[PDB]
Scaffold this active site. Structure first.
Site, PDB file in Angstrom:
ATOM      1  CG  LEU A  12      62.068  25.994  63.175  1.00 26.08           C
ATOM      2  CD1 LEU A  12      60.564  25.677  63.026  1.00 26.08           C
ATOM      3  CD2 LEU A  12      62.338  26.791  64.458  1.00 26.08           C
ATOM      4  CB  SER A  14      68.157  19.132  59.772  1.00 26.06           C
ATOM      5  OG  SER A  14      69.533  18.897  60.063  1.00 26.06           O
ATOM      6  N   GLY A  15      67.418  16.292  60.742  1.00 27.81           N
ATOM      7  CA  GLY A  15      67.770  14.944  61.175  1.00 27.81           C
ATOM      8  C   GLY A  15      67.110  13.859  60.335  1.00 27.81           C
ATOM      9  CE  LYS A  35      58.929  16.072  58.667  1.00 26.49           C
ATOM     10  NZ  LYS A  35      57.957  15.314  59.554  1.00 26.49           N
ATOM     11  CG  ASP A  96      60.703  19.961  72.382  1.00 25.56           C
ATOM     12  OD1 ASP A  96      60.997  19.221  73.354  1.00 25.56           O
ATOM     13  OD2 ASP A  96      61.548  20.658  71.767  1.00 25.56           O
ATOM     14  CG  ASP A 135      59.233   8.195  66.941  1.00 23.50           C
ATOM     15  OD1 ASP A 135      59.737   7.572  67.909  1.00 23.50           O
ATOM     16  OD2 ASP A 135      59.833   9.117  66.358  1.00 23.50           O
TER      17      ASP A 135
END
Length: 273
Positions: A12, A14-15, A35, A96, A135
């Site tokens: 899906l 990444s980072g 995850k 999102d 966040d």
């Protein structure tokens, strides 16, 4: 067992948050997100009651992961030699809020009212479970398009809620408040309210108000779209430069702009379906 409990599908994304895969629980065909976080990259660790050492994210997730659908639920987790693996809810179909705003532009105030109210209710849940997300932003909010329900994700920058000052921060800078920018200090609740003002602006204008540090600390809010006077007033209040001048969540939710919120299902019917 691991890959016998879940069927793993496509990546899906990444980072800074690790790598996330689409997946399915074999038993009941529940859609899930898988995850992967490398141990070498985890900055903040904690422990579960029984002394098992885990990343803070897993602690935070367990504290909030009780039924209320405004926050993503951790279904399971696994430890491996060099990583942890987290299994999370995945709504389907989902989009999102960042993607949604990019697609639609500035939201009508009725829709931003429903969305923002749902985010307020979700953050109050976190705070009542002793968790500060740190966040909150459009990317970390998923819309269950069929139900009209918003869910908060990614507690990887979060912390235990406390009443004393925070002097660390690893969230998104353009949602961070001026006291962080000037002094590398903030308190949890007032910092949260600032980021909610950034989010509300983003919803009604279709982009964030400040890009550079100088803008953040200057606290001049210029509206680039037509926004009602009541909505402008709530945004400006949340974006007060002095933390103590910002509203409480109670004051936000009693604001005149916030009355007569639609229900999630009505929101889905009118604005999403």
């Amino acid at each position: 067992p691991l890959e016998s409990q879940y069927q793993v599908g496509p990546l899906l994304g990444s980072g800074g948050f690790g790598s996330v895969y689409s997946g399915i629980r074999v038993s009941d065909n529940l859609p899930v997100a898988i995850k992967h976080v490398e141990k070498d990259r985890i900055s903040d660790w904690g422990e579960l009651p029984n002394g098992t050492r885990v990343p803070m994210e897993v602690v935070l997730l367990k504290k909030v992961s009780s039924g209320f659908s405004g926050v993503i639920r951790l279904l399971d987790w696994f430890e491996r030699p060099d990583s942890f693996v987290l299994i999370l809810e995945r709504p389907e179909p989902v989009q999102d809020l960042f993607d949604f705003i990019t697609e639609r532009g500035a939201l009508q105030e009725e829709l931003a009212r429903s969305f923002f109210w749902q985010v307020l209710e979700a953050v109050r849940h976190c705070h009542n479970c002793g968790v500060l997300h740190r966040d909150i932003k459009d990317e970390n909010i998923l819309i269950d398009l069929n139900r009209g329900e918003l869910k908060l994700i990614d507690f990887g920058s979060g912390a235990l809620l406390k009443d004393t000052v925070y002097t660390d921060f690893d969230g998104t800078r353009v949602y961070s408040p001026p006291e962080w920018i000037r002094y590398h200090r903030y308190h949890g609740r007032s910092a949260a309210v600032w980021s909610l003002g950034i989010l509300l602006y983003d919803m009604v204008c279709g982009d964030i108000p400040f890009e550079h540090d100088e803008e953040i600390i200057g606290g001049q809010v210029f509206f680039r779209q037509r926004v009602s006077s009541e909505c402008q007033h709530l945004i400006r209040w949340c974006l007060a430069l002095r933390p103590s001048d910002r509203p409480t969540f109670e004051e936000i939710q009693n604001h005149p702009w916030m009355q007569d919120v639609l229900l999630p299902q009505e929101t889905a019917e009118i604005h999403l379906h």
